[PDB]
Amino acid sequence: RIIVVALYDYEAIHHEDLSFQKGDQMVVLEESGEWWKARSLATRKEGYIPSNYVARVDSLETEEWFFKGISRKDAERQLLAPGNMLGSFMIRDSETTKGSYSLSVRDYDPRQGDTVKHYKIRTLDNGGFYISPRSTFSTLQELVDHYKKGNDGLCQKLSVPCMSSKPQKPWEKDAWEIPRESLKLEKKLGAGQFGEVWMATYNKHTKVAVKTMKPGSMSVEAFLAEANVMKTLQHDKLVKLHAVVTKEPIYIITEFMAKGSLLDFLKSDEGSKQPLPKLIDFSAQIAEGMAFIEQRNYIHRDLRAANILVSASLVCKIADFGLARVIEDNEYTAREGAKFPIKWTAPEAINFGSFTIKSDVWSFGILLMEIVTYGRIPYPGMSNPEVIRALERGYRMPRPENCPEELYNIMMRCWKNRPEERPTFEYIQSVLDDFYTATESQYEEIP
Numbered sequence: 001r002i003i004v005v006a007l008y009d010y011e012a013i014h015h016e017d018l019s020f021q022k023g024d025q026m027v028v029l030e031e032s033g034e035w036w037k038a039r040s041l042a043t044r045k046e047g048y049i050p051s052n053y054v055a056r057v058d059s060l061e062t063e064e065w066f067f068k069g070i071s072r073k074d075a076e077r078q079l080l081a082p083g084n085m086l087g088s089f090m091i092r093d094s095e096t097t098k099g100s101y102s103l104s105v106r107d108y109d110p111r112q113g114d115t116v117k118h119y120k121i122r123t124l125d126n127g128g129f130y131i132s133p134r135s136t137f138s139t140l141q142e143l144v145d146h147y148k149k150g151n152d153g154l155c156q157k158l159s160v161p162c163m164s165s166k167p168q169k170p171w172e173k174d175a176w177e178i179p180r181e182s183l184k185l186e187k188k189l190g191a192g193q194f195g196e197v198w199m200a201t202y203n204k205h206t207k208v209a210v211k212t213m214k215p216g217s218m219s220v221e222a223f224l225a226e227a228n229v230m231k232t233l234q235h236d237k238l239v240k241l242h243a244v245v246t247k248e249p250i251y252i253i254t255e256f257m258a259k260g261s262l263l264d265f266l267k268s269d270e271g272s273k274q275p276l277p278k279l280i281d282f283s284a285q286i287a288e289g290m291a292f293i294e295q296r297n298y299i300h301r302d303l304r305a306a307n308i309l310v311s312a313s314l315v316c317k318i319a320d321f322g323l324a325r326v327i328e329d330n331e332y333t334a335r336e337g338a339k340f341p342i343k344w345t346a347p348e349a350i351n352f353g354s355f356t357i358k359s360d361v362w363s364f365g366i367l368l369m370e371i372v373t374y375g376r377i378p379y380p381g382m383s384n385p386e387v388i389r390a391l392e393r394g395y396r397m398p399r400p401e402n403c404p405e406e407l408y409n410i411m412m413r414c415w416k417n418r419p420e421e422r423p424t425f426e427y428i429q430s431v432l433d434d435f436y437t438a439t440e441s442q443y444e445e446i447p
């Protein structure tokens with residue numbers, strides 16, 4: 001007997017699903033990835049349910065102010081998003097103390113502007129919680145109610161929980177290789193050398209993006225072998241692969257991203273107005289996704305701003321990871337021109353075909369420059385031969401206007417001519433995540 005309660009409003013989209021009215025009760029039979037077999041005791045109809053729409057009945061996951069499964073950096077981004085107020089807050093699982101909790105609170109002061117402060121919630125040996133020893137609580141709900149009545153040493157009195165939206169519904173079960181007829185291509189979003197991108201509807205019920213590869217560009221068996229790896233690369237800063245059509249012309253079906261590529265966005269009316277700290281946050285989000293790719297011993301091979309997508313809520317997601325590996329070189333693709341751009345590519349990849357996570361690090365440095373110039377071509381005024389010969393002699397793009405010196409220093413480290421001298425993405429992620437909050441304590445040492 002394992003009982004679970006619903007969280008959001010969800011109704012059947014497939015055949016044998018159920019329905020949710022923002023609060024019901026369930027007993028799960030078995031599990032199956034993101035979909036679970038559960039039995040209803042409310043309406044007494046039984047069908048599959050999205051596991052991320054429900055919560056374990058004893059746990060904190062029912063509470064509007066608890067955010068399971070998010071990082072400290074996630075927490076800061078979520079709280080600083082528009083729509084939240086002074087004292088907006090969340091409780092989350094602690095990142096540096098397993099089993100315990102952290103409180104994150106939106107703060108403001110005229111010197112530092114909008115910030116998020118973090119507090120350690122300690123667990124008592126015989127039950128209960130505290131932030132300061134003089135104020136203990138039997139439950140986290142009691143803690144929240146206490147600090148909603150007055151700051152009692154915190155930066156702010158707690159106001160309301162961090163805003164959140166209903167999560168994406170999981171992709172249909174057992175629907176990896178799908179029939180072409182299941183997709184209606186609705187609007188062409190982009191055209192390219194080796195394919196197009198469409199907004200589409202899957203089985204009349206789900207909005208997706210579809211990359212449609214040109215005939216002659218890829219083999220089904222070679223593509224599928226790689227796509228079966230790509231689909232396992234799941235991370236908040238990588239675009240999710242939902243499905244594929246494994247017949248030429250090959251289609252790749254992913255989540256739809258409302259603001260297109262980061263290059264498009266930086267060149268748009270809205271994106272050209274992002275302030276420098278937001279640009280640095282974009283850079284950090286991409287570094288986080290590349291650190292994941294690095295941890296997974298994978299190689300992107302074509303990292304550039306045109307291959308970063310931007311969501312409606314301004315989350316950056318890495319796209320086309322690994323795809324260059326399975327685009328074929330033949331008479332069909334040759335007639336479309338250059339396979340990779342010289343200006344983004346590491347010298348050892350150009351000269352010897354040595355593509356590695358370190359050549360991705362080089363490309364990331366070029367991407368940083370694209371970001372801080374809002375989409376300018378790399379090496380303005382220079383031809384491709386000129387760039388190659390200049391790099392050989394120690395030339396690097398100079399620091400542009402409105403570029404923090406430490407960001408430029410990161411670029412220069414990425415552009416070491418020897419690959420082994422370039423930093424890891426783990427390193428880059430750390431420096432960019434902490435770019436402004438360096439020389440500042442992790443947690444607030446409350447009395």
Ligand SMILES: CC(C)C[C@H]([NH2+][C@H]1CC[C@H](n2cc(-c3ccc(Oc4ccccc4)cc3)c3c(N)ncnc32)CC1)C(=O)[O-]
Pocket residue numbers: 189190191192197209210211230239241252253254255256257258259260261264306309318319320321322323
């Ligand atoms: C001003 C603009 C109109 C210009 C336009 N910009 C283009 C920039 C890219 C845009 N683009 C590309 C993808 C995508 C989809 C699947 C995919 O497959 C994958 C394969 C492997 C791994 C992961 C994903 C990879 C990327 C995509 C998406 N999912 N949602 C929204 N926009 C997208 C389309 C406009 C242009 O350049 O024409």
